[PDB]
Design a protein around this ligand. Sequence first.
Ligand SMILES: [Zn+2]
Ligand SMILES: [Zn+2]
Lengths: 251, 251
Amino acid sequence: WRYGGDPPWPRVSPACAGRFQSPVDIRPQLAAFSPALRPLELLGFQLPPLPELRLRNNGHSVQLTLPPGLEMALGPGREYRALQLHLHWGAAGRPGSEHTVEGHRFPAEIHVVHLSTAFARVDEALGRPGGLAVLAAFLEEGPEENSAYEQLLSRLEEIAEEGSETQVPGLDISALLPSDFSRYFQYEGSLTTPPCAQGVIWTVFNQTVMLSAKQLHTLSDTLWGPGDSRLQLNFRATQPLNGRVIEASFP
Amino acid sequence: WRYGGDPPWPRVSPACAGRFQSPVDIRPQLAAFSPALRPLELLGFQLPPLPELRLRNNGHSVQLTLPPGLEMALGPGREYRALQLHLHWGAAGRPGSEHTVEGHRFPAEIHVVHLSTAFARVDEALGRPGGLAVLAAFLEEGPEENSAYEQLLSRLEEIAEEGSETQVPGLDISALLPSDFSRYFQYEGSLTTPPCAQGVIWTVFNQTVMLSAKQLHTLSDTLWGPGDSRLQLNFRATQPLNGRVIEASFP
Ligand SMILES: [Zn+2]
Ligand SMILES: [Zn+2]
């Protein structure tokens, strides 16, 4: 499968034709304030330099495989383990976030994908309610260089080739996300690539993360995808809410 | 195991000492109004007289086995199939609801237990978030004989001894539930008997159902449990919320 080209995604996986897909356009006017939504809690995200982590150009994104012991709770009793993180981006002067806010697309977006602690593997969790959870944050252009992101962005040149990988030092994974874990939107949707399984709990932070213009250019300009094409605009089209209500942890 | 005394339930199932158990004390002023909570949808609950349904004294309650085709939804795409319903009650002049409201225990309680349609079998769903969903309603004393409950209550004499069972005509299962499907409390907890599996979505109706004094007496004073012993006071004590916030579908 590819972005913006065949083969249709429903031909690859029937679930990609589900009613309750991601990403979505977040309309904060239509979000339901839900004071049951408490601040997110992360454990084990401050990684030491060793062991190193695998960073891969899989031809659709750059993906960092996370080690065991990264624990995340959406609440009491809603516990998850982090599996991997990856990024979605655009191209020179063209935004490439997956989620939009009132139709506005942001320059890029980070997804941290987690498995519910009730499941031992991803394939048992696919399509099950709350089986997977994703933490998502928008990346915007800021004045300063983000030093947490520089650790990964400085390594993209090694993995320019489609299907290539490299080992990188452990880093503070939580420093790739916003500092405010109390303000977020939450809704139930899907994986945004095949197999597009539903039951995924998406949490989208209100606060954004700032990268420099150079950093954003490095992200969009360095990697190559399938065919002789640049790996760019690697975001799925907006999917309708279809009656789902997005919750907000703040009024 | 048995209600009242030992064997401590943790000795039978260590799961019963989990952090997120049911039932709980509902305190409506501390419940969180969540406008995303939509009216419950129940289709296929209006059963014809045939085929007949199994009604069983199992020593811990009276349980009606439900046929296939009772579909329930808690939300968009969050669907369930009904498995069975059973009751909890007290004894002469003593209430035996499981859930309580601000300390108040009601005469009795009905539990309609469902399986998430993401799972083929109950055993796969046990311990998985949202795997099972229970619809719970309080039973109260009113001036009139409840016609719906009378179809079950008039058959208890036939199954008085522990482990006996009879066949009853199909009935409208939705007629056992309260008037307003838009007004409920919701939280995540557990089965209230061993094996005390967690991940159970409990939906407790704001409105009650009314049975006559004669009907409540009949429920509490007809069935026999484990030993020459009456089947009475078959409720678990309330359990600490341990940080869980009870949500409400209404302000
Ligand atoms: Zn993604
Ligand atoms: Zn019960």
